Structures are given as C-alpha cells and as structure tokens.
Design a protein around this ligand. Structure first.
Ligand SMILES: Nc1ncnc2c1ncn2[C@@H]1O[C@H](CNS(=O)(=O)NC(=O)c2cccc(O)c2)[C@@H](O)[C@H]1O
Ligand SMILES: [Br-]
Ligand SMILES: [Cl-]
Ligand SMILES: [Cl-]
Ligand SMILES: [Cl-]
Length: 396
C-alpha cells in the first residue's frame, strides 16, 4: 500500500518495506567507507527480526538499546519496530548510574548492548547485539504483527522547564510522519542526512527517520563526542544535503568554520534559543538555507521550521511540518491574536501517547475544540505569540 491520502500513516516497518521495495538500489546507510543499500538493509532487518522473535521478544516488550553508532544500530531499530517492541534508546555516553535509572524508569525488560561488560545490572536481562547479529540466517520468514500508526514505538526521557523528569511514550505515527516530504526543505530520496544526534534524544529521529523513510541516505557519524574536523570531511565526502544541528554544534561551526554549513542545501538548528547574530553570520556566509527549528520530545521529532532570510526579538520558529498543527492559546484556551501572548500547544501526528505518569499526562495532553475538530493538544509550557505573517515566535 502506497496511499496518496497524506493523513493516512502506516506503522514504521510498513513504510520502510514500501521504501525499500521502491528504492532497493539506493544507498541507505554509510559508516566510514562501508555502504549498505535499501535492499541489503531490508534483508538484514528481516533476518534480525526473525532472530529477535525466536528469542521470545514480542510486540509490547520494553527493549532498551545501548549500541554505539554503527550500521548495526539502525538494523536493530528497524527490527525492533518490525516486531512491535518498544525501544528505549540509551545514551552510550552516560554514566552507568544514570542508565540504570533510565531503564528502571522505562520498565525495560531487556537491554541489547554492544558491550555487555559496561552495562548496569538490574531486573533487565542483558542481550549481546554482537551475538544476535551473528545468528542471523538467510531465512527471514516470520509471522509478524499487524501494527498500526498508534502502537507505541519508543520511550524517550525528557525534563520540564523546572527540571522535573518525564518518560514519554512515542507512537509509530510520530516518527512515521517524517516520511512525508517537508515542503520547506524540499527533501526527497536524493538527499543525504548526517546521524550525529544521540539516539536517546528525540532530535535523532530527524536524522534517522527522515532519511530511511524517504529513500534518502543516512551517513553515520563516528561514535563518541563530536570531532568537527571529521564531521566537516564527512559532510563533504558523503555529500550531506540536509544537516540537522543542535545549538552547540551550530554555534561552534559558526565560530570555527562557517563555510562548512554551506556545503549542504539546508541547515536546521533546533533545541533552544539561538543568538540571532549567529544566524546572521551563517546566512551571510553562503547560499545554504538556514532554519530555526522547533521540536519537543512530546511531539516525537522536529515540528516547525522558519527559514531565515534577512536582518529585520528571538527568531520565529515558523510554520509546522506536515500533519502538525501549532496554536498559541491564551489563558482561556482561545487562539491568540497577532501580538497577544499565550502558550504554544501542538497537535497532530507527532503528539506522544502520553507520559508514564497518568496525572501529568492529563495535565499536559488536553483536548480542545479547534477549527471544527476536538483536537488533542500537547501543552508545551513555551510562552509564545504570532508575528505579522502568522509565524510563531517563542518568547521565553
Ligand atoms: N528552535 C527553538 N527555539 C527556542 N526554544 C526551543 C527551540 N527548540 C526547542 N526549544 C525548547 O526546548 C523544549 C523541548 N526540548 S526537548 O529536549 O524535549 N526536544 C527537542 O529539543 C527536539 C525534539 C525533536 C526534534 C528536535 O530537532 C529537537 C521546547 O519546549 C522549547 O522550550
Ligand atoms: Br547561542
Ligand atoms: Cl532503486
Ligand atoms: Cl557510574
Ligand atoms: Cl513520566
């Protein structure tokens, strides 16, 4: 099925199967000089999924992943999606104490890891990603679940503005929406993305799933902390065209090698306020399209984009991605006028299933009649308003 009804989204493995069948000879993954086509990637995902099912992993099992950046990492993500497991990606750069707190808060039953020696002990059962990969047979025949867009796919950790920790349950639809080409970016199967954001952060979905659910290429940064010299060579040598950056990596690049930012076609800076002067230096250094991007864990992935063009307050966060609705509501749950201040609320395909805390879920996921639809909204706790062109601007 390849439906032209853009709102009708499938579960992640179904979109990938469609993409891998349509672009089987396109390159899906690049690590160093190892390159993997969609055809080979789909074969490895099927074989691993069969292995995972024969290790009694089933739909709804909470499975943590601690695998350094590598092609195997993304083969495991796809295979766990195909069996309907709920992934809990773990920061490989985090101390063992914190990882155990993550897995206990997530309710992880299993921990798949590429280094079973450096993992915390607990109620979860540790599985070796290396031994699972070794056991992959040429037969990938399996009886897999019929997954829907609303089935859970991921558990990601986040914090509120005042530091309270929250466990967010993300549905397949929240990352499956990234298979829809974003008109602001003009992306397609011809693009190439750079995987640098840690898998424990929702921003990593921007890179992983916009690539693999569109037929584009994902080139994988080396594991560990960012090496800007290697990243610059990698951006050039693999022809990265869609570059997603945190505020730290963007600022550092503006300060030490701004020209690197103009090798890609589009550069998206998300995660926090950015000094507007940094945008002005970047915009004036080349013809790449530089965007201020808004995302939240509770909306799955990148949610809004604002293209910076000129010199003429914080930069707006712009207009929502496909299937995302953003509304600034005042204290009476009324849409705000231009210049009126309120709180940003987000609705549509990205909205998470909720928190592990049911009382917090009911506070922050509320249903509001809006434009004829009883719409489920996530309350961002971000103060905001509209500008003259209806662009959304967060004002902190
Ligand atoms: N351009 C921006 N300007 C100003 N403030 C921004 C911002 N972007 C985020 N914030 C703040 O961060 C909160 C959420 N942070 S998060 O860690 O939960 N998830 C992510 O950042 C994330 C998730 C998916 C994709 C992606 O690209 C990033 C949000 O509510 C705001 O306060
Ligand atoms: Br900054
Ligand atoms: Cl092809
Ligand atoms: Cl520790
Ligand atoms: Cl929670």
């Amino acid at each position: 099925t390849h439906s032209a009804y853009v709102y009708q989204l499938k579960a992640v493995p179904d979109i990938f199967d469609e993409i891998s069948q349509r672009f089987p000879d396109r390159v899906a993954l690049i690590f160093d000089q190892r390159k993997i086509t969609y055809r080979e990637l789909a074969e490895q995902c099927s074989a691993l999924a069969a292995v995972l099912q024969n290790n009694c992993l089933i739909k709804g099992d909470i499975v943590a992943i601690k695998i350094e950046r590598s092609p195997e990492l993304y083969i495991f993500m796809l295979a766990l999606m195909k069996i309907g497991a709920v992934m809990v990606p773990v920061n490989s750069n985090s101390p063992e104490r914190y990882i155990g707190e993550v897995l206990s808060a997530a309710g992880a039953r299993y921990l798949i890891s590429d280094d079973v020696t450096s993992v915390p002990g607990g109620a979860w059962h540790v599985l070796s990603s290396r031994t699972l990969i070794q056991n992959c047979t040429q037969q990938r025949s399996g009886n897999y679940p019929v997954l829907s867009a609303d089935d859970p796919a991921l558990i990601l950790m986040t914090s509120g503005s005042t530091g309270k920790p929250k466990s967010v349950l993300i549905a397949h639809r929240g990352i499956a929406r990234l298979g829809l080409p974003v008109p602001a970016l003009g992306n397609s199967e011809r693009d190439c993305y750079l995987q640098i954001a840690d898998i424990s952060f929702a921003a990593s979905a921007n890179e992983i799933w916009m690539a693999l659910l569109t037929g584009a290429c994902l080139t994988i940064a080396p594991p560990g902390l960012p090496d800007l010299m290697a990243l610059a060579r990698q951006i050039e040598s693999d022809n990265v065209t869609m570059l997603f950056l945190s505020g730290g990596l963007f600022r550092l690049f503006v300060e030490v090698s701004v020209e690197t930012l103009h090798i890609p076609d589009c550069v998206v800076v998300s995660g926090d306020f950015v000094n507007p002067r940094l945008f002005s230096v970047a915009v004036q250094a080349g013809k790449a399209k530089i965007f201020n991007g808004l995302g939240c864990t509770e909306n799955s992935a990148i949610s809004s984009l604002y293209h910076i063009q000129s010199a003429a307050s914080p930069v707006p966060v712009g207009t929502p991605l496909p299937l995302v609705e953003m509304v600034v509501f005042n204290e009476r749950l009324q849409p705000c006028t231009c210049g009126e201040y309120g709180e940003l609320f987000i609705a549509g395909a990205g909205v998470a299933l909720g928190y592990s805390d049911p009382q917090l879920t009911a506070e922050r996921f509320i249903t509001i009649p809006y434009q004829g639809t009883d719409m489920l909204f996530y309350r961002t706790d971000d103060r905001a308003t509209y500008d003259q062109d209806r662009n959304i601007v967060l004002v902190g």
